[PDB]
Amino acid sequence: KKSYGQIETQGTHLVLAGDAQIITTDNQNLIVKKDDKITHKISLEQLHAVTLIGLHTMTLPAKHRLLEHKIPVHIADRTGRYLGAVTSFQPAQNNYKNWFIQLQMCDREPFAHAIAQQIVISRIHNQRQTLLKRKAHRKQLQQTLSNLKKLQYKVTAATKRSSLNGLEGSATREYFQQFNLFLPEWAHFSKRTRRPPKDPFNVLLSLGYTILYSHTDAILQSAGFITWKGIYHQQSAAHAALASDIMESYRHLVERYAIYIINHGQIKQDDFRQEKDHLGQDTIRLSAEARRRYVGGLINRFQKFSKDKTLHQHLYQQAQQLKNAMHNQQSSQFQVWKELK
Amino acid sequence: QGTHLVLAGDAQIITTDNQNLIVKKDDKITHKISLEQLHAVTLIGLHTMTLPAKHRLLEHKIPVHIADRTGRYLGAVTSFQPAQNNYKNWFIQLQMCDREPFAHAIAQQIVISRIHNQRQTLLKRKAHRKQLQQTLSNLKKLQYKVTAATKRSSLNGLEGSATREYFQQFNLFLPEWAHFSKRTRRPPKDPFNVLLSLGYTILYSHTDAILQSAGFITWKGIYHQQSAAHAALASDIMESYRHLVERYAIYIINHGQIKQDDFRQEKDHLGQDTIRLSAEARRRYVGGLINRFQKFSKDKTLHQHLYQQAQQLKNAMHNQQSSQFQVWKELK
Amino acid sequence: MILPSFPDLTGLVVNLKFTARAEFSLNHEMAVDAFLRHSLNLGESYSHHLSIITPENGRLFYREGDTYRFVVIAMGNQQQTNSIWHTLINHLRKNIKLESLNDLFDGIPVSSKESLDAYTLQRAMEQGLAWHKAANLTEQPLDIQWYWQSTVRILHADHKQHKGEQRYCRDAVQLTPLLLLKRIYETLNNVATYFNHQAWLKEQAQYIEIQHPDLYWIDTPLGGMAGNFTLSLKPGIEPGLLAMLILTQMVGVGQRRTSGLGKYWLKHSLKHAHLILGLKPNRVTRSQTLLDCIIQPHIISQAIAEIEKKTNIDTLNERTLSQVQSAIGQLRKHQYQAPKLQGFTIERLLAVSPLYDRILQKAAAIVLTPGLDAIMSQASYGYRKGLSRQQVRYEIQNAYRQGYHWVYESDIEDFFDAVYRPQLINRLKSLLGNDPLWEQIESWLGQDIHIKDTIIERTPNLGLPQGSPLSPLLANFILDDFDSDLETHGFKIIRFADDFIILCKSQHEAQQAAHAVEQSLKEVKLSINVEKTHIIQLNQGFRFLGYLFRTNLPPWLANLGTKSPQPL
Amino acid sequence: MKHYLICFDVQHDKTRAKLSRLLEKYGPRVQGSVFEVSFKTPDRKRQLEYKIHQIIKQSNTEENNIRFYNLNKDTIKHSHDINGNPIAQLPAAIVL
Amino acid sequence: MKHYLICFDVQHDKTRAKLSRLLEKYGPRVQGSVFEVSFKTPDRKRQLEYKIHQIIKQSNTEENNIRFYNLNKDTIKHSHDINGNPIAQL
């Protein structure tokens, strides 16, 4: 039960990335038993969310208790791809005010276009910056950077929300094609394979993105939002659109940690387990101990955000800034993160 | 679409064969539905669900709607696509529950259906018809006036008069000890009001859960007052189906499954005198009433029927036409 | 054998007219006693032979045209006191007029007064033994209620220790059944001896019990104790004890019975076979009852003038005046039937009666106010108008020392939902005497509200309706009876200057009562809208009666919990 | 949310037992007769206070030495025992 | 300037008697085994803990069941009794 810092304003964010836990309830407490051995007895007054990566159980009265207290729970599988969530659709104190405001404002075209343009420009700037701190490969990485600049040079001139998806897709493609230069030969890849992750490197990304998504989703739902409706991500596949919309700027913390883990010898190809699942498909996953090490390291790097503020205490700030942008009907109040020049 | 499977019985067990969903009760297979013809699941109470079943459902984008034992709606195991339906139709409901031509058309149809069904209930006795010819003609006369009343208070008065004229006659049916005369009291002093109260509460709770599952906001009503302490839409749509409770109560008292022994006279903590139903009798009655809910029709059970009705009303609001929503009338 | 001899009691009922504006005190035995002493001038022997019953008590301000009735009781054999009394009383014309005189036992008028009827001891034994025969099941509690004539003076165990004014009984705990029977035997033996094994036997044969006492202390500007208690009878009692009870109903018990103090009456359990023994309840009764005083025209005009300020009249007034006059005719006919309440919006929704019945209630309040005010001034549970400021601050600081650290805003409204009516009616029946108005009072207080074809009732024998004129007067009249129910829950009330203040240790039971009331009202609204209920019986929560349409804790706890307290 | 520690001293041998049996659910029995509890909405604190009052009425001696000492974030940060071990500390994210 | 709360449960009565008598002077005995202590400079805290070590060595029990909590200026503000009385106000 390796804890990872001091509790926040809203509570503690339980994670179950282990091996075959069985959550049960007390009507007052949440008890995690592995093979009739009690591992934790957390109180329901301190719990904030819970993530279930693997083959973990949850008894139905526990679902009743977590659905009464409006505590989110997110689910995934051992490969790391996302599955779904157990959320409720009644508001905080039955006040449907903020939800109605959000559902009105998200489909207004100029406002949503301005915020989607901000998010895309932030993402492309962050990608250019992350490709800019590898000195030894600068000669190999000049032209690509210039091309990303050109793509950024067009994002300001995009006048319809339908073009942003294509521009961001091209940027991500030309970005991910360059990781073959840093990574070892056994972890090479050319395409981000999302739904069935079928590469050694892609499992790392698809297992970090769900932790990041669960954090931002729990923060957003505690703010007062309804995460299912998004600004820039119209059509999504099992990800809540708004959480998967905000975490666009913060998803180089998962594409740098993965490079650091692979290069510096913490995770090597002896950890991956390969199987055929449910019909026969080549699926690569992590054993339980490597999953625990990876998730613990990721949460530790989340805590050591830029000093005086952890990532939770930055995402709550940005959620408040977005809410104030939407209530006052001004798109200029919300400012994307835009990692330093 | 497909089958919208509802489990409201007592402790079924759900399992998957990786290409089907199998619901067993005491190891007797009660349901076996292919995953391509399944559209949703509704779990009212405590029903154990094996983990491969839950993963297979979540992978196929099939929401699982979880509700309490009484019938309160809590939430749902979903993903993006099945949870877009829970909010993509909130604004249009608030628009179309206030526009008076639409709302008054639907509130005319509901009362028409209620008076029709409570005529049909007396038609089926066939043993005291001669004493009830006058009452049936009176109910027809009251029903024909609903087609013209262009205000809500007129509808309220007509329905109240019809209900009084319908309950004035049950003393011919019930036995000697169960004869009741005065209108219903909030603390009951007669058995028949107790039985009706349990039935009305059960039907209201289940109607509320099934309405919420379809994507509705149940406090915005079309014919009743938007208020707290109750859901307007649930107590609104449940009027057409109220005859089931009354028919079942008459059946139970007449056929002797409940006698005078089962009622208990007592005083509550508040001190007010009450008569209530004993725990064994209450469990027996609730089980029998849920059985009658399950025996609604050969094709559909009542919960699937209410889901289909909610989908019809959703389409009627969406296309603005106020007569695409045809109400249940118990046509023979 | 208990009394081997006794004098032959005899009586006269005198009814006399008033020709002048006269005002009495609250107890009338002093003035009538002085009247007979300045009239007859018998000296010492008047103490030995005569006694006074005054049925009228608690009516202060009399008027011209109003009568007066009282009873004189004489003892002895071949007395001529009644003869000279007749001869002197016939010419008593002014001030005081004369209407009539009636013999107490036969009931015939005073004429043909050669010999009057003799309440012989054997007749007392008969009227006790036949009562025992017609009332014995040997498995019955045989409760009979005991009402005082506003004063009695007895000694608790004849204590010499306390040595002063404290030597008398002034509360329920000093009432001992053996003490009462011993005092009764003392008075009867004194009267017999003026003209032992036995005192031992009456010590063994005490089976009686004192139940639900309400007795208190009244200090006449003297001293006495007044109230009622349920005397309960166990089956082993013999008729001999009953004979003593019935004879002492007329002779009296206590110190100084010559001034008329120390008499009582007892009203047996209802549905008995009609057996009236000794003194008849319809003879010793106020000559002009309270209801006639209600229907007197000038009081009704006064009430009309009083109520019209917040009348919110909307209809024609000549019909209102015809209605009140017709209702006056009905009340005189003893056939009136009160209207049921109606719920009107003001914002808040308030349930009031039609205005003419409100006028009749205000008239009854105007009549009842002076006697109740005088009895609250002269009693232990008395408001203190002139508060000693140092003493009042000392009481507050002493209560703070007790632990009562929180205070509440004082409003009598919060105590309208907790009043138990039969205790109130019993207290009034003890003070003003038996009267036909009291039934009418209940019919004004226990009505049902109509709101939108819904009948909101109330729990039987509980509560006082808000928005009525009799309620604020009769609520603080019997407020002290809540003290024990405030003591168990850690509440105290301090009275000063026709006001009080509420002191409490903690604020948790108040909030639990408020939360219970709110939940109950939410369930009642749900069962209005769902199960189509039509008769709703509420015990508490009438202040939020508008909410329905737009363990047990006492009902005043909720009304306190709706407020937010303050520290000292 | 608010963190409290409840410390009580009651002499009735059965009433102390009933408070001990009640307060163990909401928080750990950290000391012999000192518990730590946490709440998110003050009505939940009020419910616990009412339960405590209901239990202590059976004493019939009116004991009132039950104290709710608050605990902040920095207050917890500065707290320690003699050994120097930080105490009353809570985790931010358990990676079970 | 720091406020502290001192609490313990040592098993043997005579061993903890010296604990109690040592701790009477530093702060009032607010409850059966609970003390409210005010400090100006941490050296007094260090010497008090040194003496507590002395007596727990005397007891030969190795009791670590001595617990010190802080009491800030606003932590006091929400602190109270069951009857609502504010406590530990200076």
Short mmCIF file of N, CA, C and O in Angstrom, two decimals, chain D residues 6-40:
data_model
loop_
_atom_site.label_atom_id
_atom_site.label_comp_id
_atom_site.label_asym_id
_atom_site.label_seq_id
_atom_site.Cartn_x
_atom_site.Cartn_y
_atom_site.Cartn_z
N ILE D 6 -11.31 12.61 18.65
CA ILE D 6 -12.28 12.55 19.72
C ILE D 6 -11.63 11.90 20.92
O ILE D 6 -11.11 10.78 20.84
N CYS D 7 -11.65 12.61 22.04
CA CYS D 7 -11.09 12.10 23.28
C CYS D 7 -12.12 12.20 24.39
O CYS D 7 -12.66 13.27 24.65
N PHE D 8 -12.41 11.06 25.03
CA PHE D 8 -13.50 11.01 26.00
C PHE D 8 -13.04 10.31 27.27
O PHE D 8 -12.17 9.43 27.22
N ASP D 9 -13.62 10.70 28.40
CA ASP D 9 -13.30 10.12 29.71
C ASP D 9 -14.60 9.99 30.49
O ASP D 9 -15.11 10.96 31.05
N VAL D 10 -15.14 8.77 30.54
CA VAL D 10 -16.40 8.48 31.21
C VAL D 10 -16.17 7.32 32.17
O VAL D 10 -15.43 6.38 31.85
N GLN D 11 -16.79 7.39 33.35
CA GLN D 11 -16.52 6.43 34.41
C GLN D 11 -17.54 5.29 34.47
O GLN D 11 -17.20 4.23 35.01
N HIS D 12 -18.75 5.46 33.94
CA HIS D 12 -19.72 4.37 33.91
C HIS D 12 -19.17 3.21 33.10
O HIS D 12 -18.83 3.37 31.92
N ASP D 13 -19.10 2.03 33.72
CA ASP D 13 -18.34 0.93 33.15
C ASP D 13 -18.99 0.38 31.88
O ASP D 13 -18.32 -0.20 31.03
N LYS D 14 -20.31 0.57 31.73
CA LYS D 14 -20.99 0.08 30.54
C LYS D 14 -21.13 1.16 29.48
O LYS D 14 -21.07 0.87 28.28
N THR D 15 -21.31 2.41 29.90
CA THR D 15 -21.43 3.51 28.95
C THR D 15 -20.13 3.71 28.19
O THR D 15 -20.13 3.95 26.97
N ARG D 16 -19.00 3.61 28.88
CA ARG D 16 -17.70 3.66 28.21
C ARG D 16 -17.58 2.54 27.18
O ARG D 16 -17.05 2.75 26.09
N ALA D 17 -18.09 1.36 27.52
CA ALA D 17 -18.06 0.24 26.58
C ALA D 17 -18.89 0.53 25.35
O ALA D 17 -18.49 0.20 24.22
N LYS D 18 -20.06 1.15 25.53
CA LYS D 18 -20.91 1.41 24.37
C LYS D 18 -20.34 2.51 23.47
O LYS D 18 -20.42 2.41 22.24
N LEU D 19 -19.74 3.56 24.05
CA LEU D 19 -19.05 4.53 23.19
C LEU D 19 -17.85 3.90 22.49
O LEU D 19 -17.55 4.24 21.33
N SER D 20 -17.13 3.00 23.17
CA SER D 20 -16.03 2.31 22.51
C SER D 20 -16.53 1.47 21.34
O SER D 20 -15.92 1.47 20.27
N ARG D 21 -17.65 0.77 21.52
CA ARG D 21 -18.23 -0.01 20.44
C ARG D 21 -18.79 0.85 19.32
O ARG D 21 -18.89 0.37 18.19
N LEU D 22 -19.17 2.10 19.59
CA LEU D 22 -19.67 2.94 18.52
C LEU D 22 -18.56 3.57 17.69
O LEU D 22 -18.58 3.48 16.46
N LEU D 23 -17.58 4.22 18.33
CA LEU D 23 -16.67 5.07 17.56
C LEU D 23 -15.62 4.30 16.77
O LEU D 23 -14.88 4.93 16.01
N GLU D 24 -15.51 2.98 16.92
CA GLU D 24 -14.48 2.26 16.18
C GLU D 24 -14.78 2.16 14.69
O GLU D 24 -13.87 1.89 13.91
N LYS D 25 -16.03 2.37 14.29
CA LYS D 25 -16.40 2.22 12.88
C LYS D 25 -15.90 3.40 12.04
O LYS D 25 -15.39 3.21 10.94
N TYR D 26 -16.05 4.62 12.56
CA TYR D 26 -15.79 5.80 11.75
C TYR D 26 -14.30 6.07 11.60
O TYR D 26 -13.86 6.65 10.60
N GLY D 27 -13.50 5.66 12.58
CA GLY D 27 -12.07 5.89 12.54
C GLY D 27 -11.30 4.93 13.41
O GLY D 27 -11.86 4.25 14.28
N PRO D 28 -9.99 4.85 13.20
CA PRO D 28 -9.18 3.87 13.93
C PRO D 28 -9.04 4.20 15.41
O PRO D 28 -8.96 5.36 15.80
N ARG D 29 -9.00 3.15 16.23
CA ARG D 29 -8.75 3.29 17.66
C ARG D 29 -7.26 3.53 17.84
O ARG D 29 -6.47 2.63 18.12
N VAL D 30 -6.87 4.80 17.68
CA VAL D 30 -5.46 5.15 17.62
C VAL D 30 -4.79 4.99 18.98
O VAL D 30 -3.67 4.48 19.08
N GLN D 31 -5.47 5.42 20.03
CA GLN D 31 -4.96 5.34 21.39
C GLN D 31 -5.88 4.40 22.17
O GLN D 31 -6.78 3.79 21.61
N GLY D 32 -5.62 4.26 23.47
CA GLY D 32 -6.49 3.44 24.30
C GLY D 32 -7.92 3.94 24.28
O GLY D 32 -8.86 3.16 24.11
N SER D 33 -8.11 5.25 24.44
CA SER D 33 -9.44 5.84 24.44
C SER D 33 -9.48 7.16 23.68
O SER D 33 -10.23 8.07 24.03
N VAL D 34 -8.66 7.28 22.63
CA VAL D 34 -8.66 8.44 21.75
C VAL D 34 -8.78 7.94 20.33
O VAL D 34 -8.00 7.08 19.90
N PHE D 35 -9.76 8.46 19.59
CA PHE D 35 -10.00 8.05 18.22
C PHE D 35 -9.74 9.23 17.29
O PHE D 35 -9.77 10.38 17.70
N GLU D 36 -9.50 8.93 16.02
CA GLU D 36 -9.42 9.95 14.99
C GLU D 36 -10.53 9.70 13.98
O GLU D 36 -10.73 8.56 13.54
N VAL D 37 -11.26 10.75 13.61
CA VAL D 37 -12.38 10.64 12.69
C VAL D 37 -12.26 11.74 11.65
O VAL D 37 -11.56 12.73 11.83
N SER D 38 -12.94 11.54 10.53
CA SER D 38 -12.91 12.48 9.42
C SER D 38 -14.31 12.60 8.84
O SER D 38 -15.02 11.59 8.74
N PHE D 39 -14.71 13.81 8.46
CA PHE D 39 -16.02 14.03 7.87
C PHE D 39 -15.88 14.91 6.64
O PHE D 39 -14.91 15.66 6.51
N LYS D 40 -16.84 14.81 5.72
CA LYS D 40 -16.85 15.66 4.54
C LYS D 40 -17.95 16.71 4.57
O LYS D 40 -17.75 17.80 4.01
#
